[PDB]
Amino acid sequence: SGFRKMAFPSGKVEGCMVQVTCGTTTLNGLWLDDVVYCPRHVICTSEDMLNPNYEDLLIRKSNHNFLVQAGNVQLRVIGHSMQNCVLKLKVDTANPKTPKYKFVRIQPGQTFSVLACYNGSPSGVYQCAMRHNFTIKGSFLNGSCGSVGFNIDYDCVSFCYMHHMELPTGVHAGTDLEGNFYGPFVDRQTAQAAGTDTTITVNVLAWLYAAVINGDRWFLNRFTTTLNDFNLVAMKYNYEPLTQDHVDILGPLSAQTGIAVLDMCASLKELLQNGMNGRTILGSALLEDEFTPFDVVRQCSG
Amino acid sequence: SGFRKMAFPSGKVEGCMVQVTCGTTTLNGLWLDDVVYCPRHVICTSEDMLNPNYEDLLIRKSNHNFLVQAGNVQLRVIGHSMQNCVLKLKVDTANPKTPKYKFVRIQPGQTFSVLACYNGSPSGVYQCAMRHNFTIKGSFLNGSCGSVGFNIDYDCVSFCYMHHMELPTGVHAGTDLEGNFYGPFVDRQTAQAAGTDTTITVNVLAWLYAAVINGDRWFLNRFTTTLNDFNLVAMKYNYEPLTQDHVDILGPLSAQTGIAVLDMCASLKELLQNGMNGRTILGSALLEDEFTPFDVVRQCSG
Numbered sequence A, B: 001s002g003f004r005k006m007a008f009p010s011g012k013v014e015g016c017m018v019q020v021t022c023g024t025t026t027l028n029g030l031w032l033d034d035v036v037y038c039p040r041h042v043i044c045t046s047e048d049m050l051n052p053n054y055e056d057l058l059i060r061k062s063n064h065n066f067l068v069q070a071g072n073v074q075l076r077v078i079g080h081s082m083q084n085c086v087l088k089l090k091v092d093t094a095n096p097k098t099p100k101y102k103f104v105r106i107q108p109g110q111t112f113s114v115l116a117c118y119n120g121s122p123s124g125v126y127q128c129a130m131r132h133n134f135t136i137k138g139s140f141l142n143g144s145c146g147s148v149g150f151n152i153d154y155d156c157v158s159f160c161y162m163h164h165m166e167l168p169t170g171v172h173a174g175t176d177l178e179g180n181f182y183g184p185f186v187d188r189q190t191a192q193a194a195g196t197d198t199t200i201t202v203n204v205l206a207w208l209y210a211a212v213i214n215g216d217r218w219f220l221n222r223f224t225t226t227l228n229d230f231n232l233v234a235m236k237y238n239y240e241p242l243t244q245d246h247v248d249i250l251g252p253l254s255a256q257t258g259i260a261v262l263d264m265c266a267s268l269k270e271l272l273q274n275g276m277n278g279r280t281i282l283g284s285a286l287l288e289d290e291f292t293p294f295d296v297v298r299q300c301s302g
Ligand SMILES: Cn1cc2cc(Nc3nc(=O)n(-c4cccnc4)c(=O)n3Cc3cc(F)c(F)cc3F)c(Cl)cc2n1
Pocket: A024, A025, A026, A027, A039, A041, A042, A140, A141, A142, A143, A144, A145, A163, A164, A165, A166, A172, A186, A187, A188, A189, A190, B001
């Protein structure tokens, strides 16, 4: 047992990470087959980062303006293209370490692992969720642009996030791997504000189930609730409404624990109206919402 | 910015993970050069797991009793040896993916990344600390025996933990890679109890500094404290006494933030005596003690 913020093993992504430089601007790229993917922002200079026109910027570049570094080996760029907010640099060598992969866009509330890199060098791995305002509460410093988020399904890396920038509040914004931003943000060095966030209710319930699986039961109660009355209470606390699809998704955990979803919702209602009274759940003093039902099942069942 | 539970990239360890079977007992091993390291408990049968004599058990085995599986390739065992609680299986192939590595034993309060594996297959990576009672609060299911904990220094993997077992309270016990247990535990399927734990004070202070670096300042105050008066208050709350060496270690964070260590100790004293009054620090409602000063510097500075 035990319950931890768990990321996917990162090796398959580490073997894809490279450094991309254009002019004096540098960041991280993702080398898959004979293409390197990176934020198009790399073709900006300090003069252009505020209000760039990327079509003009790219038309003014050629292959030789792009330096791609894989370890100590320079990959020669033999083509360049823009796809929305990502640059695609065709190189003359296919990555021998290319894993089986796919580009998948994720939904608010789902989770993924982030491999933070600097200068093409992986430095750390952590787990995060896509918030309902399409930001992620990541951990990123200057130089982390182009770091990727991903999930692993069996042997297949599903890339879902490429990091672009930090917002004023310190949360992070990026795109899927087709270069389409998550949320209403643009790759311009302008002060952009994240919208309002909500608590991912289904995830909180999944985490309460994880706690029960690990012997934390003090928050349980004899009461049950209707879905509608739960939602009436939960909206007041900035929680996402719970739907029947969410109940269905929680079916497996409900079965493994013998606690019906609406019964656990009654526990959640009480915790929202009363607080925790100085107690904890799975070592936390607040309700955790960055674990999906799938993450819980993976960690607690296998 | 941002502050997350961050593990080291795991690829270098993933390429070392193998499956070891003896009889019907199976678990994970660590293949480095031409040696596979695993818990000696693998030579136990269900009859022997309660009160084994491992010297007898190993004398009754030969190389052909050990099946080592690296992916789909079977490695032939050509020698076998015991070193304390780890078995060393000499195989006829050196691991081509062997990273530069070392075996280092860690101290209570220090942190490391865990690569949870099952049947030799890496499944997840998370970060944990060695508690003062020499347990770790890990996340492990049946089949995780032999999973390793490690740190990375530049290009060198410092292995520091091999997982053996789960204690009744759900916390975990294991050895260093020379087979020497952390804490007063033995590799016998007997009900063993973890001793009392304490909060890792220096780590809490390091995390308060991380919070200040990320703009969480509400807990700061004008007061300073002496080291002795802080310790008098902190012992009452089950915190480790703070030493001058701990102050020294916190020097860099103190400098980067301009807040003297004893000033932050005054904040910590107040949080201990008053609680958080419904506020949070770096997204947590309780004081976090699994980040060392080094982890904070690595994440917040680079
Ligand atoms: C020589 N040199 C200077 C460079 C500056 C760069 N800008 C950034 N670097 C970053 O690390 N963070 C960043 C910082 C912290 C966490 N997370 C990301 C940026 O936000 N920006 C700003 C930013 C990035 C975008 F991709 C975008 F569309 C709009 C922006 F305002 C980069 Cl990308 C390369 C540099 N090379």
